[PDB]
Design a protein around this ligand. Sequence first.
Ligand SMILES: Nc1ncnc2c1ncn2[C@@H]1O[C@H](COP(=O)(O)OP(=O)(O)O)[C@@H](O)[C@H]1O
Ligand code: BEF
Ligand SMILES: [Mg+2]
Length: 700
Amino acid sequence: TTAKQAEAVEDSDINPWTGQRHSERYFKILKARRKLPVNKQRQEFLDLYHNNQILVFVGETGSGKTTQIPQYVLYDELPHQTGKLIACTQPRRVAAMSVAQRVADELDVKLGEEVGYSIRFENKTSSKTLLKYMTDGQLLREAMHDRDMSRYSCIILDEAHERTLATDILMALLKQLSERRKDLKIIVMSATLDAQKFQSYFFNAPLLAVPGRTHPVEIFYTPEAERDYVEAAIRTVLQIHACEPEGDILLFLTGEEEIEDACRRISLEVDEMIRESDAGPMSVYPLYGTLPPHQQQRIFEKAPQPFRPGGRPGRKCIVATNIAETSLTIDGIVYVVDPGFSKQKIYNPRTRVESLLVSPISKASAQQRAGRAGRTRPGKCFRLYTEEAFKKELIEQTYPEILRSNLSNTVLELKKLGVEDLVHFDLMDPPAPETMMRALEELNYLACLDDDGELTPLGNLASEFPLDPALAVMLISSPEFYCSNEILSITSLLSVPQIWVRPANARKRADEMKAQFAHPDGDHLTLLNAYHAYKGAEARGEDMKKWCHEHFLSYRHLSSADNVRAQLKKIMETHGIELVSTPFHDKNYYTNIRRALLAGFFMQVAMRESSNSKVYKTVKDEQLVLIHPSTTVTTPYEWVVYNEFVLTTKQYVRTVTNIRPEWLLEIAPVYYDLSTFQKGEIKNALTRVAEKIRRQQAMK
Ligand SMILES: Nc1ncnc2c1ncn2[C@@H]1O[C@H](COP(=O)(O)OP(=O)(O)O)[C@@H](O)[C@H]1O
Ligand code: BEF
Ligand SMILES: [Mg+2]
């Protein structure tokens, strides 16, 4: 129970957890461990843990939170021998695995047995497991089948400052659960918390602040912000490799393309430095999320030895995204370059699209990056921006992800957890209640939720897609319209911002190009033609940047759309959604597609006010709109399906496609149930087309 007791147990010749003998590596590691800052307050932790259900723990980067606290908790439950496990949630998978291996080494056990990790598509745990590291998403997935989380006695949310929606949702679930289960302990850890906020959230939970730090990190700033960070970073790296002594380098960049380019740019410069200045060898390892794990774990490889003794030291440079921003202890790292940028998610409500954008990091992010040094040995962090900018310009904390995300998918994931009430589901920073309710009923009409508010198999499958639920339903139900691939492409195109560029000046030319890509019946089909042209010109080998520039298309969003198409396709193949397509020569090649649109966009339909008028009254609510000027369709029919709603001098609908009113009554009967449908001119029109159908189909 008390610290001295646990420490007395740790000194045992025989391992209390396996019954095997402690190797002296365990004891050397142990003597190293007891010099950590958090250790010097171990008891102070225990009697807080003993007397409180929820605890907030704050210690500087490298204090020993992630690796020592779960072990403390483990030794505190020693005399009881509970069948329940201890869970620790890292924000990234690499972190979870690395730390899991580390703690497995510290407890002198085999990884996967007593100490293990758990990630999607890979469970490294056994029936012997008492300590489990995992990602917050993985725990969030386990919570779907076990809403009480009976398998765990203590849960430790780590790096909870990131405010990722998985972390937020976890905090809310655990907060609601803590009133239900009193046998569950909850710890919240970070080096960069808004402590008072998290305390206030968890019923004024106590705070433990460990002031000590292992090794110092010498942070430096640039006298003036650099015009371009990339080559500023590369120049900094080369300057380190040249002037600075022995030590591995760590550099943070935004994207993967940028990382590769910078990687072999650094390589090409380094080789010249070798051939001209007799500099030591440098091995450059890239690191990003879409990499295969076996390449990700190559960053732990030892730095190359000097060419011959007494010569310039060889070293290892790691160019990575922000996945290495937290929780990583890469031994050998001394120098850390911080350009101060990250690819952060933003969200467009009108077009319903999530998109990434390079933005300045937060202060917490910067401190977290610099914290990757001074863990095993004293380090330095070269921040490529003014100290004044860091103190008075950088955001103090990362803006919550829930507020930058599609609430329909979020709500879908909440009902996926079985959260019966949302408005009184206490999120730390809750989204607008009405938006959540509208999201709920919109999910109800899409047959993703029952009238009772539970997951439809359709909705459950739609959650597996990285898309707006409507778009996802469209894609899933597309094979029933005999045009899966085309709808896949259209989906991927609607998953990205507007690919057509229409400059404020000289928009005539843009209209002319778009007219050359035009399809008379719908703008969606025009998008399809644009993508097909793109893939053709790419197939030739023609330069696609200049090609997109000339034909007034956005290379960024077309490329993004393409990658999205690949990923989506592989997902469909994984869950067994068959990709089929009617031949182009077929009579109903386009009608199939146009019908498949209504599978998900039946709620966004506009009817012409009257034959002579240009004004449209939308099916949703009753708002007067016009067809957006940038439209392709020459003569828009009485009924159109629109993908966007814009509000300017007058309200428009954008990216429209002509449909037939019968398709509405066919594809979405429950929504267009004329028995209970709202009174209005639309109901009248639909009753007319109905009556015609009755006539002809009773005639036989
Ligand atoms: N894989 C490892 N190899 C060597 N030393 C490590 C490793 N992981 C952690 N350490 C040491 O243990 C200390 C505690 O690290 P950690 O618990 O991850 O800190 P925190 O979780 O507080 O950020 C570090 O300062 C580091 O010196
Ligand atoms: F605070 Be430590 F770097 F996880
Ligand atoms: Mg940590």
